[PDB]
Design an enzyme around this catalytic site. Sequence first.
Site, PDB file in Angstrom:
ATOM      1  N   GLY A  46       0.875  -1.152   0.000  1.00 24.10           N
ATOM      2  CA  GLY A  46       0.000   0.000   0.000  1.00 24.10           C
ATOM      3  C   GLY A  46       0.915   1.204   0.000  1.00 24.10           C
ATOM      4  CD  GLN A  51       3.002   5.830   3.235  1.00 22.61           C
ATOM      5  OE1 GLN A  51       2.122   5.255   2.577  1.00 22.61           O
ATOM      6  NE2 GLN A  51       3.926   5.168   3.953  1.00 22.61           N
ATOM      7  CB  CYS A  92       4.515   2.222   8.195  1.00 20.82           C
ATOM      8  SG  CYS A  92       3.710   3.602   7.531  1.00 20.82           S
ATOM      9  CG  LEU A  93       6.610   1.335   2.367  1.00 23.07           C
ATOM     10  CD1 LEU A  93       5.823   1.579   1.069  1.00 23.07           C
ATOM     11  CD2 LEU A  93       7.826   0.436   2.238  1.00 23.07           C
ATOM     12  CG  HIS A 134      -1.338   0.988   7.158  1.00 25.89           C
ATOM     13  ND1 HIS A 134      -0.526   0.667   8.228  1.00 25.89           N
ATOM     14  CD2 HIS A 134      -0.602   1.801   6.338  1.00 25.89           C
ATOM     15  CE1 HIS A 134       0.648   1.287   8.067  1.00 25.89           C
ATOM     16  NE2 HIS A 134       0.627   1.964   6.923  1.00 25.89           N
ATOM     17  CD  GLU A 135      -1.346   2.503   2.702  1.00 26.01           C
ATOM     18  OE1 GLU A 135      -0.857   3.676   2.694  1.00 26.01           O
ATOM     19  OE2 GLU A 135      -0.689   1.534   3.105  1.00 26.01           O
ATOM     20  CG  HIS A 138      -0.487   6.947   5.605  1.00 30.49           C
ATOM     21  ND1 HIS A 138       0.533   7.407   6.418  1.00 30.49           N
ATOM     22  CD2 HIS A 138      -0.207   5.643   5.344  1.00 30.49           C
ATOM     23  CE1 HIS A 138       1.413   6.433   6.588  1.00 30.49           C
ATOM     24  NE2 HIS A 138       0.988   5.368   5.959  1.00 30.49           N
TER      25      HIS A 138
END
Length: 160
Positions: A46, A51, A92-93, A134-135, A138
């Site tokens: 994702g 991000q 998470c990236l 999760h996305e 953000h």
Amino acid sequence: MIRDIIRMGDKRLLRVAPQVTNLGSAELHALVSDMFETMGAAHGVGLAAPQIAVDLQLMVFGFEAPAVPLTALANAQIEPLSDEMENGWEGCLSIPGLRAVIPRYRYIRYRGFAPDGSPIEREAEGFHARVVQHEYDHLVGRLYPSRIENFDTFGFDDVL
Ligand SMILES: O=C(O)C[C@@H](Cc1ccccc1)[C@H](O)SCc1ccccc1
Ligand code: NI
Ligand code: NI
Ligand code: NI
């Protein structure tokens, strides 16, 4: 084109993002194509536009290899379909090297638009549902450490 992913600590991850208003545009098609490429280079499932420091309600997600369909979703809105919560691992990236166990809704519906303007409405469960949650976080300026309940599970991937 691969974009730089910003890391936790950057104020840009803490914003509430505005709506996409250029559905079907070349400009939006280019940004989506860049987000898919970016997600792929980082080995993500994702990626949300904040991000890569783009303040918009837009996320990409998915993977062949349970498979989650490759999706680009603008102006997302989510709703739980029961109160049932499930624990699972997340990373998470923007928080490289870490993971934790995070409770999410087991069942959801999400709605929004594909980049071409077509409406999207789907029911999702388990891992599919988690990624979307999760996305979505953000887009409202939330990261997963604020949802950890058991801090014994928070740690470096290679060590856990
Ligand atoms: O950093 C993001 O916002 C993208 C995350 C999404 C994610 C959400 C829920 C659960 C796991 C990941 C990155 O893709 S993290 C890399 C990853 C890849 C496969 C399995 C687990 C984690
Ligand atoms: Ni690679
Ligand atoms: Ni993330
Ligand atoms: Ni089912």
